[PDB]
């Protein structure tokens, strides 16, 4: 009767979208497609309100309500893109373009040696600044209140202009100088103020906040074996799961793990096409 | 015959070896076959090149169960004449061996970049796979005296032989 | 309709890409390859019915089809090289140099010491001249600052003769191994002359080199089909001999894969016999010195040129001219074949030294070179 049943075998390959709710509301934006993902999980644990009958029998269960099944999931993105970090790091993405500085100053006390300095480290560019050029730089005392005055850093008195050879290295497009360990002039109780060009280099940032992440998922099937199924979740809370190894001998991964939550009391947790 | 019609488009290729073609030797009319002794009526005549077959009956590759079609290695023992240099007894026989190796070389050769030199003569038209052409011997006869010199160069002529239309 | 029983031959061409990108660079014919295999290793996902049977399958895909293969090149050359070691053909020049100094420390008797490594050179420098070698303890520190290093305090010269040979063109130095003024703990500061010199190398990096692959079919026996990889990555297979009796082979093994979600790994191309080109329009050209030495500035010697057409015929009244490397004057230097096909002209060169001699035709056919030497 049932030994020539056509059971349908499936390998599962689909991609996932997440559509990113607006802060504070259900109203969403795009289903934003993850890229690769290796890895779709859907994880369900349970508990029941079992209840035992106390007038016979040890144990003899008479009622066994369900109180919670926690519908959620979890799934690995490979495509490491900046969207995506902005979901794993519970933030925001930031497109931005560096103000174009000319003779922008800067001070660094103390320093030392055999140490690395970023250029530009402000509020507007908490990670420095990028595209430097027309470095210069001038010695001093660790102990004076040295400050970036109007006009040239060699302008500043009891300062002392200090040449790169045996002394600093710029990585210009990177706004990083490094202290050489050997230098001579920026040894002992020293102190620095450097003098610099600021490109208008369009920039981007990911802001890791800490905002809770509610969205719709959907799975849509491109399954080669079996047929094709696509899941919704209308509404989610995506949040980090585990690791995110930035270095390694394979691909790196973002792990997110979602739970599914009514979006409505009229909508349910998933639907299945 | 496949065999027959191989063998005259060699002779036509060799009978080509002529000074209005760029050799320093004329064999036209001079490349015998099925000949196993020449004399004055030839030597009287030289340079001359004789393709005889060898007399090994050997077992080809075939392609198919029913043995029917096979890669067939079928060795020709080309030889020639020319008089000799007294005094260089044998230099004479390595020129011609080298106007007739360069021109049955036409017919396996290609380009620097692997495009055949010579289109049309290559593999004689479709009728010849491969010629492996072996390292030739010029040598005076073992026994007896001559002032004719000898070249012995064995070819390999490969061949596609269906017995069904042999 | 017939069974096309074959014999493979075929000319074997590498279209690398440009890296990181998919941007075809040109089909480099990598010369004879003797073998070219396709190898397709295959895994398929089986399962099995747990409701009825002990162990009936009753579904299988494949999951896994590694279309690829193997090839081997007999013609050495830089690129394919370049290819094998997983790197990039470098032609340089190296900068000339006068009075350029270097200094060795330790130096052992019975070594070899290449002059001018460095990373402009790291081979090291070719065709030195005007050698000349000062020895010094080992025990201090010299430098080689302006000046001769004859200057250099405590530096002393040393007599080539039983002290070293001086390979110039190679810049190698041989501490002879019993020689006397440099036994014991010294080192040598050295002065040489560097000639410039257009100086290709190959280097070796560790970067994996992808590109089209295609294979054109020559088979002698048997219809015509054209193997075509949209898309491979090409690495060294086996083991390359530098030394043995045998031709030198660099084996390959490439793997296929889709150059995009639209075209596949593999396509073969059935080639329908095509009309043949018209054999008396065809060229072909030869040329031979009659001897490969002459005395400078003399009579000089005579290359024979023969032009044939595609049927091994010889051409009357093919335009022929010549041209030659350097300090050579050929004559004639154009040239009308003659019935015979052949031409022939003179070279003949003032300096001594070597030279070689090529012939064009009419478009353009070919730079067939034969070696003059003049002394």
Request: glycine share 8%.
């Amino acid at each position: 009767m049932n030994d020539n049943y056509q059971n349908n075998y499936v390998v599962g390959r689909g991609t996932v979208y997440f559509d990113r709710f607006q802060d504070g509301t259900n109203r969403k934006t795009g289903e934003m497609y993850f890229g690769n993902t290796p890895e779709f999980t859907i994880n369900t644990d349970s508990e029941t309100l079992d209840h035992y009958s106390s007038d016979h029998g040890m144990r003899v269960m008479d009622a066994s309500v369900l109180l919670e099944a926690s519908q959620g999931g979890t799934f690995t993105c490979d495509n490491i893109n900046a969207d995506n970090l902005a979901l794993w790091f519970l933030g925001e993405v930031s497109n931005t373009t560096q103000t174009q500085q000319t003779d922008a100053k800067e001070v660094f006390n103390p320093i030392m040696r055999g140490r690395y300095y970023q250029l530009g480290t402000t509020d507007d560019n908490p990670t420095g600044v990028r595209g430097v050029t027309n470095f210069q730089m001038v010695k001093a005392d660790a102990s004076i209140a040295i400050s970036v005055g109007s006009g040239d850093i060699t302008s500043i008195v009891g300062a002392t202009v200090v040449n790169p050879a045996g002394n600093y290295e710029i990585d210009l497009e990177a706004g990083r100088i490094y202290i050489e360990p050997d230098s001579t002039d920026l040894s002992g109780n020293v102190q620095i103020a450097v003098q610099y060009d600021v490109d208008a280099q369009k920039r981007t940032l990911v802001i890791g906040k800490s905002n809770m992440v509610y969205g719709a998922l959907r799975m849509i099937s491109d399954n080669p074996v079996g047929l094709n199924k696509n899941y919704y979740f209308p509404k989610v809370s995506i949040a980090p799961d585990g690791d995110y190894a930035l270095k390694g001998d394979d691909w790196q991964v973002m792990s997110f793990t979602f739970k599914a939550m009514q979006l409505n009391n009229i909508t349910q947790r998933v639907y299945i096409d | 015959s496949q065999r027959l019609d191989i063998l005259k488009a060699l002779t036509a290729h060799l009978e080509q070896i002529t000074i209005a073609n760029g050799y320093a030797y004329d064999l036209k009319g001079k490349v015998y076959r099925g000949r196993d002794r020449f004399g004055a009526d030839f030597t009287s005549r030289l340079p001359i090149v004789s393709i005889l077959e060898a007399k090994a009956t050997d077992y080809g590759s075939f392609a198919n169960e029913e043995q029917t079609v096979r890669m067939d290695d079928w060795v020709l023992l080309v030889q020639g004449w020319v008089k000799d240099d007294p005094r260089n007894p044998t230099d004479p026989a390595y020129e011609l061996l080298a106007e007739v190796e360069k021109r049955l070389a036409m017919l396996v050769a290609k380009d620097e970049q692997g495009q055949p030199m010579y289109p049309a003569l290559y593999r004689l038209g479709g009728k010849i796979a491969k010629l492996t052409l072996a390292q030739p011997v010029v040598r005076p006869p073992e026994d007896g005296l001559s002032d004719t010199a000898f070249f012995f160069l064995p070819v390999r002529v490969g061949l596609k032989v269906d017995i069904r239309n042999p | 309709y017939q069974n096309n029983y074959v014999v493979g031959r075929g000319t074997v061409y590498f279209d690398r890409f440009q890296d990181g990108t998919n941007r075809k660079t040109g089909e480099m014919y990598f010369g004879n390859t003797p073998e070219f295999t396709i190898n397709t290793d295959s895994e398929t996902l089986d399962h099995y019915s747990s409701d009825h049977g002990m162990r009936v399958m009753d579904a299988s895909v494949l999951l896994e089809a590694s279309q690829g293969g193997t090839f081997t090149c007999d013609n050495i050359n830089a690129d394919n090289l370049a290819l094998w070691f997983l790197g990039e053909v470098s032609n340089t020049t190296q900068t000339q140099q006068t009075d350029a100094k270097e200094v060795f420390n330790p130096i052992m008797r019975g070594r070899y010491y290449q002059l001018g490594t460095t990373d402009d050179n790291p081979t090291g420098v070719r065709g030195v001249t005007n050698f000349q070698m000062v020895k010094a303890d080992a025990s201090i520190a010299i430098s080689v600052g302006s000046g001769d290093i004859t200057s250099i305090v405590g530096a002393t010269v040393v007599n080539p003769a039983g002290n070293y040979e001086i390979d110039l063109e190679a810049g190698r130095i041989y501490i002879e191994p019993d020689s006397t003024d440099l036994s014991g703990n010294v080192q040598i500061a050295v002065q040489y002359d560097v000639d410039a010199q257009k100086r290709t190398l190959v280097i070796g990096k560790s970067n994996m080199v992808y590109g089209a692959l295609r294979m054109i079919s020559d088979n002698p026996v048997g219809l015509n089909k054209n193997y075509y990889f949209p898309k491979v990555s090409i690495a060294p297979d086996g083991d390359y001999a530098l030394k043995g009796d045998d031709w030198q082979v660099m084996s390959f093994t490439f793997k296929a894969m889709q150059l995009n979600n639209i075209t596949q790994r593999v396509y073969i191309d059935i080639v329908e016999a095509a009309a043949a080109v018209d054999p008396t329009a065809q060229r072909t050209i030869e040329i031979t010195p009659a001897s490969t030495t002459a005395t400078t500035g003399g009579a000089g010697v005579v290359c024979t040129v023969t032009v044939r057409d595609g049927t091994g015929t010889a051409v009357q009244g093919d335009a022929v001219t010549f041209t030659t490397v350097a300090g050579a004057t050929v004559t004639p230097n154009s040239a009308t074949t003659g019935a015979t096909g052949t031409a022939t002209t003179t070279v003949n060169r003032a300096a001594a030294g070597t030279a070689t001699v090529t012939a064009t035709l009419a478009n353009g056919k070919a730079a067939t070179t034969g070696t003059i030497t003049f002394s």
